[PDB]
From a paper:
In this work, we present the structure of the SnAdV-1 fibre head domain solved by X-ray crystallography, using the multi-wavelength anomalous dispersion (MAD) method. The structure of the SnAdV-1 fibre head domain was determined by multi-wavelength anomalous diffraction up to 1.6 Å resolution, using data collected from a selenomethionine derivative crystal as described. Four monomers were present in the asymmetric unit, three (chains A, B and C) forming the biological trimer and the other (chain D) forming a trimer with two crystallographically equivalent monomers in the crystal (space group I213 has a three-fold crystallographic symmetry axis). Amino acids from the N-terminal T7 and 6xHis tags could not be modelled in the structure due to lack of density, as was also the case for residues 234–236 of each of the chains and residue Lys345 of chains A, B and C. Using NCS-restraints, the structures of both the seleno-methionine variant and native protein could be refined to low R-values at 1.6 and 1.7 Å resolution, respectively, with good geometry and Ramachandran statistics.
Numbering used by the authors:
A (entry chain B): 240 to 344
B (entry chain C): 239 to 344
C (entry chain A): 237 to 344
């Protein structure tokens, strides 16, 4: 019943992230959740080509980007011409997992 | 198995608005209740807003009587009293973002 | 049809009577599978939480590509591992209250 996009992205240094983008209907409301996982660390922003389908999901957020909490820091995921950038609040020795959603009527 | 899944938009007297979802799930001997919260706004202080009777009933059921909830930039505690939600916050938030709080019980 | 292929839940308790509820969930999302550990306690924790876990939960806990589960709670961070059916959750700081959080990974 939920609709999911799932894919693994990699940057030019071989850091890998997996993302799941979920859409759910809750009567008059729709909820869209981005789930993100990496075992790697990041010094700086993660930049990688994303599918057209993930890019379209990412663009739909009312803020135009996805503020996301991980265990050791905060990210903001955006997309421009099919390239994801996730900026980070601090260097992350390990990213771990987190999720960011919105609901709209 | 998902026994309840309601969603509601709440707004305080100064136009800050939140979407809340309340989900109840049955997991064999366990029940799980999850509160999801989203706002694109900031909060300077506690968020106080009228809630539906159904959401209010859900919010009251928690064994702690309130819902400790992590957001990206700070922490909230959501409670309800006669249909009025209060969410107190750990620090002023220039943007709230999303988070969730759940418990499991037998 | 559900995408949930495993959904189990159990209460664990240490020798001091701190109690946690854990839920282990597997979701099949096509080429990818997600495995999530959910953890809840109304208690505080002064130090690592150690408690026996079921065979099924222990198998789930072991499967992670890191061999353990980094998990964010509202007031601090934990790492959940299992060894011979004993869970240990180490914590980043003493927690006057644990609350809830979840840790997942996605695998192809």
């Amino acid at each position: 019943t939920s609709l999911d996009i799932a894919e693994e992205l990699q940057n030019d240094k071989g850091v890998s992230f997996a993302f799941q983008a979920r859409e759910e209907e809750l009567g008059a409301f729709t909820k869209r959740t981005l789930f993100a996982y990496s075992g790697d660390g990041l010094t700086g922003p993660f930049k990688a080509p994303a599918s057209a389908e993930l890019s379209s999901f990412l663009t739909a957020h009312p803020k135009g980007r996805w503020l996301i909490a991980f265990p050791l820091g905060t990210g903001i995921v955006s997309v421009d011409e099919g390239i994801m950038t996730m900026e980070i609040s601090r260097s992350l020795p390990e990213v771990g997992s987190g999720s960011s959603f919105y609901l709209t009527e």
